[PDB]
Ligand binder design. Structure first.
Ligand code: T9R
Ligand code: K
Ligand code: K
Length: 545
DNA sequence: TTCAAAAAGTCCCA
DNA sequence: ATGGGACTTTTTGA
């Protein structure tokens, strides 16, 4: 439950908040970490503070009580008035307390360390500087009893599938003094995610965001599947409202390339651009001027969105795939009448323009009337996981029988011509499904509304949607998950805007040529790339880019 | 009644 | 052993 932040990032975060502190004007700064752990940040705060006091000790001695301000008194002063920490783990607090003590009995100095829940603590005062790495706990791994507390007391930032670190953002902001500075490393997903919409609104309207360091899919925490960003914000009265954005360019770099993180930020490994905080909508579109011009051209030119013209839906959720999904060559499928069997595909089966032939079959068990008529299917296939099936939420409440699919959706939505795409991918992969394929929630589908069929065809749509233009266009606002992975979920895919002009016929014809080649047995892959290049030129011409 | 979001992902191998 | 790559379930709030 304890995570170690890399030292190069700890040093950067502490420097970001304290490098320009006027210790002569205010020799009593309050620096807080509300998930301090063993003290990765606080122990570094001590070192920075000690040099700060020692470098100006005679100036403080002259300006203030000359007996109080001596070098031998710096250690006691820092612990009494400057360093504050909180963590739920008692053992970590005890270790940090020893570490701070060992920086030097005489007078039994008191240390401001609290073993508590930082989201419930009654904070008796606000703080000049707040740093640290909060806990990240999503909606599956958080206790329901605790989530009831969060939904009640942190509703301004925490609803639905929000994360625990949203609340730490709110708590840090609320107890930051006027003119104070906060700097934290959290997951990056709130920058684009639907869940973070309220959190983004809370940050934008309560603090000035100085800087966002976006590591994208780079691996900052070794052996941890998370993508990181560093946010620095303040409560200073400033007319200027511009954010420094540092966005990494190569996700494969090692974080220890230089001795300092700021060396990496200034280098060619990162790009820098500024964003006007006043121009942030509910979405934070953090791109350079070239991409903003590119994005705005497409938005203005396109009069339709996919949501306008299409019906979206998520795939089947069985609740226990091993009980219902079988290999098409499994001998146990001889027990299942073919009326119960559906073709089943995974996200990896989706390519551009077409789906691979399915290798798995879904038992649509919802169509099994009762347990007596098809006892063989229940006893020998589905019942092998009856205990796990009975633990599903809708089975415990009696809504579903133990052998039914948890979310079987509507069969008629899948058994039709439609477009399918993987839920997480490195690139746009929109395919026309001709084979009534079913899938789990790792594949999303949509079909065109009847009233828009004479304006848009499936062949045209997969043409533009798979183009290099729309690959770049979608990724401008897409949710970056891990290295070379973006979420392709309807909450953003359905916002993709599309156009219709004089190039419609040739774009559609090129797409049909690609599909015809891809479906050939002696498939000529090379010519497909040439046709794609020609289609990209038409699309770039159509959108004036 | 029933939708869709959510990576401190998960798992394997060189 | 670790770091990097291939691939992606079902729990959950609304
Ligand atoms: O690296 C993360 C670090 O933060 C610490 N930490 C995790 N959760 C909390 C916390 N409130 C949230 C909460 C949630 C559920 C609870 O049953 C109880 C409390 N309040 C303070 N510190 C917390 C950890 O111990 C790690 O040292
Ligand atoms: K004096
Ligand atoms: K990562």
């Amino acid at each position: 439950g304890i995570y170690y932040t890399p030292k190069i990032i700890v040093d950067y975060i502490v420097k970001k908040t304290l490098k320009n502190h006027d210790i002569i004007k205010n020799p009593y700064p309050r620096i807080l970490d509300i998930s301090c752990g063993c003290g990765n940040f606080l122990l570094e705060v001590y070192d920075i503070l000690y040099d700060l006091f020692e470098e100006n000790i005679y100036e403080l001695k002259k300006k203030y009580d000359e007996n109080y301000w001596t070098v031998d008194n710096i250690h006691r002063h820092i612990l009494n008035y400057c360093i504050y920490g909180a963590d739920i783990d008692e053992k970590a607090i005890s270790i940090l307390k020893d570490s701070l003590t060992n920086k030097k009995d005489e007078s039994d100095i008191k240390i401001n360390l609290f073993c508590c829940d930082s989201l419930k603590k009654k904070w008796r005062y606000k703080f000049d500087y707040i740093v640290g790495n909060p806990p990240y706990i999503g909606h599956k791994k958080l206790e329901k009893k605790y989530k009831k507390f969060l939904l009640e007391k942190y509703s301004e930032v925490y609803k639905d599938k929000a994360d625990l670190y949203f609340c730490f953002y709110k708590k840090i902001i609320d107890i930051l003094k006027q003119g104070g500075i906060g700097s934290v490393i959290t997951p990056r997903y709130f920058l684009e995610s639907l869940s973070g919409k309220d959190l983004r609104e809370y940050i934008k309207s309560n603090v000035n965001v100085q800087e966002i360091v976006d590591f994208l899919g780079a691996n900052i925490f070794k052996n941890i599947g998370v993508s990181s960003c560093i946010l620095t914000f303040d409560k200073k009265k400033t007319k200027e409202t511009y954010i420094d954005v540092f966005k990494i360019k190569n996700e494969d770099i090692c974080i220890n390339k230089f001795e300092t993180l700021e060396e990496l930020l200034k280098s060619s490994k990162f790009e820098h651009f500024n964003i006007n905080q006043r121009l942030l909508s509910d979405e934070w579109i953090l791109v350079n001027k070239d991409d903003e011009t590119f994005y705005n051209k497409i938005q203005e030119k396109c009069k339709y969105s996919l949501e306008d013209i299409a019906i979206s839906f998520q795939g089947i959720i069985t609740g226990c795939d091993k009980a219902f999904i079988l290999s098409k060559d499994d001998v146990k499928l001889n027990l299942v009448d073919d009326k119960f069997l559906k073709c089943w595909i995974k996200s990896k089966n989706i390519n551009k323009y077409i789906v691979d032939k399915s290798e798995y079959r879904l038992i649509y068990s919802n169509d099994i009337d009762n347990e007596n008529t098809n006892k063989r299917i229940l006893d020998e296939i589905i019942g092998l996981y009856k205990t796990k099936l009975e633990n599903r939420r809708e089975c415990k409440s009696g809504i579903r029988k133990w052998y039914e699919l948890q979310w079987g959706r509507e069969k008629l939505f899948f058994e039709r011509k439609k477009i399918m795409y993987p839920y997480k991918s490195n690139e746009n992969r929109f395919a026309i499904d001709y084979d009534n394929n079913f899938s789990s929630a790792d594949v999303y589908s949509f079909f065109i509304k009847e009233e828009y069929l004479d304006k848009f065809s499936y062949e045209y749509l997969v043409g533009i949607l798979n183009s290099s233009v729309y690959d770049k266009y979608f990724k401008i606002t897409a949710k970056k998950m891990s290295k070379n992975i973006y979420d392709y979920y309807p909450n953003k895919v359905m916002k993709i805007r599309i156009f219709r002009d004089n190039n419609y016929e040739e774009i559609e014809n090129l797409s049909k040529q690609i599909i015809s080649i891809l479906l050939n047995k002696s498939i000529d892959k090379g010519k497909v790339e040439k046709l794609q290049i020609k289609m990209d030129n038409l699309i770039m011409d159509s959108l004036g880019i």
